[PDB]
Design an enzyme around this catalytic site. Structure first.
Site, PDB file in Angstrom:
ATOM      1  N   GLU A 152      40.369  59.277  66.056  1.00  0.00           N
ATOM      2  CA  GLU A 152      39.105  59.744  66.056  1.00  0.00           C
ATOM      3  C   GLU A 152      38.326  59.018  64.840  1.00  0.00           C
ATOM      4  OE1 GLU A 152      41.339  61.730  67.205  1.00  0.00           O
ATOM      5  OE2 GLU A 152      40.291  62.410  69.132  1.00  0.00           O
TER       6      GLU A 152
ATOM      7  N   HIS B 204      39.968  74.863  70.028  1.00  0.00           N
ATOM      8  CA  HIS B 204      39.669  73.816  71.143  1.00  0.00           C
ATOM      9  C   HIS B 204      38.435  74.587  71.565  1.00  0.00           C
ATOM     10  CE1 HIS B 204      43.563  72.359  71.048  1.00  0.00           C
ATOM     11  NE2 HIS B 204      43.336  71.494  71.650  1.00  0.00           N
TER      12      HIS B 204
HETATM   13  C1  LIG Z   1      43.159  64.790  67.537  1.00  0.00           C
HETATM   14  C2  LIG Z   1      43.027  65.016  69.149  1.00  0.00           C
HETATM   15  N1  LIG Z   1      42.458  64.318  69.817  1.00  0.00           N
HETATM   16  C3  LIG Z   1      42.613  64.225  71.166  1.00  0.00           C
HETATM   17  C4  LIG Z   1      43.107  65.411  71.644  1.00  0.00           C
HETATM   18  C5  LIG Z   1      43.320  65.534  73.226  1.00  0.00           C
HETATM   19  N2  LIG Z   1      44.851  65.409  73.650  1.00  0.00           N
HETATM   20  C6  LIG Z   1      45.489  66.470  73.318  1.00  0.00           C
HETATM   21  S1  LIG Z   1      47.161  66.161  74.284  1.00  0.00           S
HETATM   22  C7  LIG Z   1      46.719  64.544  74.545  1.00  0.00           C
HETATM   23  C8  LIG Z   1      47.732  63.620  75.136  1.00  0.00           C
HETATM   24  C9  LIG Z   1      47.828  63.962  76.616  1.00  0.00           C
HETATM   25  O1  LIG Z   1      48.667  65.252  76.738  1.00  0.00           O
HETATM   26  P1  LIG Z   1      49.974  64.772  77.681  1.00  0.00           P
HETATM   27  O2  LIG Z   1      49.952  64.630  79.190  1.00  0.00           O
HETATM   28  O3  LIG Z   1      50.817  66.117  77.146  1.00  0.00           O
HETATM   29  O4  LIG Z   1      50.662  63.400  76.909  1.00  0.00           O
HETATM   30  P2  LIG Z   1      51.386  63.433  75.577  1.00  0.00           P
HETATM   31  O5  LIG Z   1      50.703  64.905  74.715  1.00  0.00           O
HETATM   32  O6  LIG Z   1      52.610  63.774  75.792  1.00  0.00           O
HETATM   33  O7  LIG Z   1      50.912  62.238  74.717  1.00  0.00           O
HETATM   34  C10 LIG Z   1      45.154  64.252  74.129  1.00  0.00           C
HETATM   35  C11 LIG Z   1      44.524  63.013  74.350  1.00  0.00           C
HETATM   36  C12 LIG Z   1      43.829  66.281  70.682  1.00  0.00           C
HETATM   37  N3  LIG Z   1      44.392  67.544  71.091  1.00  0.00           N
HETATM   38  N4  LIG Z   1      43.657  66.078  69.337  1.00  0.00           N
END
Ligand SMILES: Cc1ncc(C[n+]2csc(CCOP(=O)(O)OP(=O)(O)O)c2C)c(N)n1
Ligand SMILES: Cc1ncc(C[n+]2csc(CCOP(=O)(O)OP(=O)(O)O)c2C)c(N)n1
Lengths: 330, 342, 331, 328
Positions: C61, C130
């Site tokens: 970010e 969130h």
């Molecule tokens: C600092 C931050 N940025 C973005 C997110 C949004 N986010 C949460 S999990 C994730 C990854 C995608 O989820 P998943 O399908 O579980 O993939 P993995 O977590 O295995 O990489 C993202 C972009 C977050 N939770 N925290």
């Protein structure tokens, strides 16, 4: 009675709490061998060593999260930001990792931590080093936010902040560091505590209630002394705590004075004064207002550098008197 | 009709970074540990499959990240550390909450947001806490400095405890992780940085990203291979040599997406199953008996999580501050007042 | 010749039309390209404009937000998306210290044309980390412009104004509004449709009480106004649209007719949006027109709980708005 | 003599097979320009130090004296159409990027004749293709990566130099900028200004996958040649590169080194460089008196320049009855 500066009063507070509880430690930039970026932690490293007074690299998000982690593991850190402008890099750790954690756990994981450092305007440090974060941190549940003014305020609150089992933000003031105050024997004690959530009346009055926090409290006392020569007795109130603020003391004052003016250093919109005005209107003291409550704040601009411009971006004594005389129609 | 007490197994050799010698390539698995590891993995599996079912039925709301296919990680890491050691991870904490001591009833009831949940329905899937388990964390990367601070407290108290701080490969580019690397090595914190790689980033050699911190890349589908690397990394931190980085290579189960070619060849429960039967540590009938008991225990817990009532509305404001006197918090308007108790 | 358009589609129309208009405009963020958007807001944009204009970023970010601000300083007009605004706290220094204050510190030499958009506030079961609303935080800061759309008209008109503005603009969207359809008039379907920043819109004419809100609770205010209308109480519902600089003249002009004011917001109460509106109404010319004190309807003063019964009571409901209105009118 | 060849120190490499040359040709015209530019920056920082000790300058005033071979050497290896950004120690770069000594000193003293009209001070001075100093440490590093992104976006083969001190080299956002710059092959030259709190002091290696080179920052000729090499690397499309400049006065002053080099090779005489010292010293005293005698900015312009390309409006002052007019 002794002459003690606010910087020395904070140093007394941290020293006594370090001596009292071995789980307490201080970390931050230049807090150790440099004796403190503003000499607040002078001599602490020479007394306690690398284990308890930890110099950190310039990695705000990193060591703030490290502090919160140690707090979850049972320690009681004191995390210093050199100024709170730099806390924005770590504000996710303050809000999401520390403030909200006890609630989400259902009462299982407390976070006893203190975030301290100077806050607000200084002298010639321009826009990126002059921001006041009282409203931002006071906006967040799970935090406690305090803003000391004089030496008694600083020592009493810093000791209450460390002994509280929850995240406490201590918004200090750099220009107050070197200011001396009469330090009574009750404040010199190692058991001296100022409870979080209660305001202090610094001057009794009957014509208007003037509420402020941090350095501008002194300007309210200067304004009240000038107005006192004109027959206007101001009741100056020192908030001390931003969250949860002591509205009962303000309401009781407004019900006597029938007039209210708030004075703050930070930006006007969505600031500290805005909350006080909303609370008196929702509260029992609104019918006791004979005039609308007005806000004295900083100018709604990024802090300029030039001396003449910065002087007019900060509440002055004449700005408080002017707003007070408008409220009283004099 | 005869059961061996122990058996020796060849384990995969870890790729090293700034290390001359790594974990051993042979290990001894006893019959009791094999049955213990098997029951633990099959419980985590049936628990995540049940959570997936409740999530599709919309009984679970918000987030529900499942760790099925990674059972050798949360169970393998627990076999290589002590209950007095510390662990923290991100949002995929269902398996780690069970391996660190919480019951399946508490985990599912929390997922369904009921009063019987481990967090009293206040946290949900992402915020479950236990003794020396500092939970899941919703903000990616944020748990990495937190774990480094838990390791600081481990060094501070001087009881030779370590902290395992896990993060997925998607979080491996959070700047605060690199800030935590530098401080952990600077102060020699007993912190085991664990990157959970699922198989965006200019370098995919996550075990080398600590630069000055040594690393080792581990096969995360082999529970014995994970256990030995954990024992190696935990002993490294206990000697005072500072932090260490550990990459666990795993795979998640949650046409072209056939990928039965991971369940068929690399499933961690099936690998431990094949190892124990060929070495006469247990019988196929024994492990099927365990599957039945585990499935009954999950359905019994799912029944509890479904019938258990929601938290009372009177406790909405509870547990805002710790060790504080009672007070009231403001509701949707100034006439709604919730009592707040520590 | 009106159409049924969801807020998600209205934002997508806005960004698409501005990308075609100015080649300096580009969109970057997590999952904005091949995934078609974390909430499908940027669907089809990558297929139309390519890797150059729709940039998938890693989860960094502070890093890619600063990259956006840097690109803005060099003359481009980036659109920086945060997946949710809870995650913007990691990058909040770049928004405040690097983007908002730069034009003032530069003495009027270095403008920063950038847009920060993404969902804000409460969702459904996403828990405390969130669900935070950042309207008061970003509205607190000079050098920024902060908007908070509600319906489809709001979203497209404001997102186009945000991109064309030469300064940092924060667009606080709402996930639960993304899938909600609204009647889209022919004027909004045009590529020239703009909603000016700093002017509020009256969504319902009334004479008994002024109800000011922004984002999703505006719909709840209209639902309350419909219920109270059957009882002879005419509410004047006002949609702020802009948080900074908010349109106080529209609120003041309404209070001078209704003599009563209620603010409704989703975020936390203390130092929130309602606090500024109430403080400004007391300092302003409309204070003498109040026949009752102005009251605030906000979210509960707690971190967002997970359980359905608890989350439902941490957000303003329609009955909570009606309750506050009847208190102000003493009925 | 018209030209002369000089030996420069060999750079330590990281993920590079061939580095910058170990010999370079310095012309007489370039030598006199580099000497005058370096000597001007030197006398300027010493004058600011006096005014800072005299409290005529307020707040912060970080001086770059001893680092004159950096800002002048970097400018000799880049074009005016290239881009540069640094942290709070930006006085030298402000002058090399085109601003006059009068504008810099008047801004330091907070007068209307300053480059930012007294609005920014020491840390926030901007110029053409110079994206200024920045008070938040590390924040300027992602900004430079974004300026390099615009360079690639516009496709005119321009590069961006992004500087940060060794104290900021542990800012997490720098590593976030590393990963994205190499991922997108951005023409960004990460420059770590190392002087003398960090687990690794090999700052030219911190980019891991990004190649790096460690340069002697006291030799202006070595800085110029390394910069030309790094700029050519980024212009060829090979992506980013990391460059560490290491920056006592008896045999390490950057002005004393160039002075001795030009006299020994008959590129200039001792009398010429002394006459330049007099010309430069006169220009500093003339600028310092202007910065002292110039009046402060008018109070009527306090709210000016909040938004760009916007209609005029008024902002609230210390109370609701003080209204400052704000013009773009
Ligand atoms: C600092 C931050 N940025 C973005 C997110 C949004 N986010 C949460 S999990 C994730 C990854 C995608 O989820 P998943 O399908 O579980 O993939 P993995 O977590 O295995 O990489 C993202 C972009 C977050 N939770 N925290
Ligand atoms: C992100 C950030 N954190 C903390 C600070 C406060 N700070 C400013 S300069 C400094 C140390 C630099 O001191 P100095 O030696 O004068 O400058 P340097 O030699 O490091 O360039 C610190 C901690 C800052 N400016 N930015």
């Amino acid at each position: 009675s002794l002459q003690v500066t606010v910087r020395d009063a904070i140093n007394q507070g941290m020293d006594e709490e370090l001596e009292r509880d071995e789980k307490v430690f201080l970390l931050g930039e230049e807090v150790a061998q440099y004796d403190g970026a503003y000499k607040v932690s002078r001599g602490l490293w020479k007394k306690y060593g690398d284990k308890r007074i930890i110099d950190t690299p310039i990695s705000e998000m990193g060591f703030a999260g490290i502090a919160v982690g140690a707090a979850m593991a049972g320690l009681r850190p004191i995390c210093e930001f050199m100024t709170f402008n730099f806390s924005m890099q770590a504000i996710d750790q303050v809000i999401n990792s520390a403030a909200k954690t006890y609630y989400m756990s259902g009462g299982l994981q407390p976070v006893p931590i203190v975030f301290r450092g100077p806050n607000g305007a200084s002298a010639g440090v321009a826009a990126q080093h002059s921001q006041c974060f009282a409203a931002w941190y006071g906006h967040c549940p799970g935090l406690k936010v305090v803003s000391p003014w004089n030496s008694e305020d600083a020592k009493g609150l810093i000791k209450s902040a460390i002994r509280d089992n929850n995240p406490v933000v201590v918004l200090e003031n750099e220009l107050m560091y070197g200011v001396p105050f009469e330090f009574p024997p009750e404040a010199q004690s190692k058991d001296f505590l100022i409870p979080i959530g209660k305001a202090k009346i610094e001057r009794q009055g009957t014509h208007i209630t003037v509420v402020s926090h941090s350095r501008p409290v002194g300007h309210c006392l200067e304004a009240a002394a000038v107005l006192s020569k004109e027959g206007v007795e101001c009741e100056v109130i020192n908030m001390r705590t931003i969250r949860p603020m002591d509205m009962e003391t303000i309401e009781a004052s407004v019900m006597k004075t029938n007039h209210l003016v708030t004075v703050e250093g930070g930006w006007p919109q969505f600031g500290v004064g805005a909350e006080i005005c909303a609370r008196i209107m929702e509260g029992p003291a609104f019918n006791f207002l004979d005039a609308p409550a007005v806000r004295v704040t900083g100018a709604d601009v990024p802090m300029p550098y030039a001396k003449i411009l910065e002087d007019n971006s900060i509440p002055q004594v004449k700005d408080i008197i002017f707003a007070i005389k408008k409220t009283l129609n004099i | 009709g005869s059961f061996a007490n122990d058996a020796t197994f060849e384990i995969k050799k870890c790729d090293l970074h700034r290390l001359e010698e790594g974990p051993p390539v042979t290990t001894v698995l006893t019959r009791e540990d094999g049955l213990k590891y098997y029951r633990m993995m099959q419980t985590v599996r049936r628990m995540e499959l049940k959570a997936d079912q409740l999530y599709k039925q919309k009984i679970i709301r918000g987030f529900c990240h499942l760790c099925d296919g990674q059972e050798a990680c949360c169970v393998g890491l627990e076999a290589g550390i002590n209950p007095t050691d510390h662990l923290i991870t991100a949002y995929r904490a269902h398996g780690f909450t069970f391996t660190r001591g919480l019951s399946v009833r508490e985990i599912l009831a929390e997922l369904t947001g009921r009063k019987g949940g481990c967090a009293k329905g206040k946290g949900g899937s992402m915020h479950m806490y236990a003794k020396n388990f500092y939970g899941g964390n919703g903000i990616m990367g944020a748990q990495v400095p937190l774990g480094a601070g838990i390791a600081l407290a481990c060094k501070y108290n001087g009881k030779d405890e370590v902290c395992l701080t896990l993060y997925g490969d998607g979080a491996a580019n959070q700047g605060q992780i690199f800030e935590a690397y530098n401080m952990a090595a600077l102060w020699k914190l007993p912190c085991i940085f664990i990157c959970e790689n699922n198989r965006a980033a200019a370098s995919t050699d996550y075990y080398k990203r600590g630069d000055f911190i040594p690393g080792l890349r581990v096969d995360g589908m082999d529970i014995l291979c994970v256990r030995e690397a954990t024992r190696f990394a935990a002993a490294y931190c206990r000697s005072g040599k500072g932090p260490i980085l550990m990459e666990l290579q795993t795979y998640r189960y949650h046409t072209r997406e056939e990928i039965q070619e991971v369940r068929s060849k690399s499933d961690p429960i099936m690998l431990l199953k094949d190892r124990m039967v060929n070495s006469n540590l247990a019988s196929v009938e024994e492990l099927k008996e365990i599957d039945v008991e585990v499935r009954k225990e999950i359905e019994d817990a799912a029944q509890f999580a479904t019938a258990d009532p929601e938290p009372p509305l009177e406790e909405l404001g509870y547990h805002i501050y710790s060790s504080d006197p009672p007070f009231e918090v403001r509701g949707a308007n100034q006439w709604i007042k919730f009592k707040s108790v520590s």
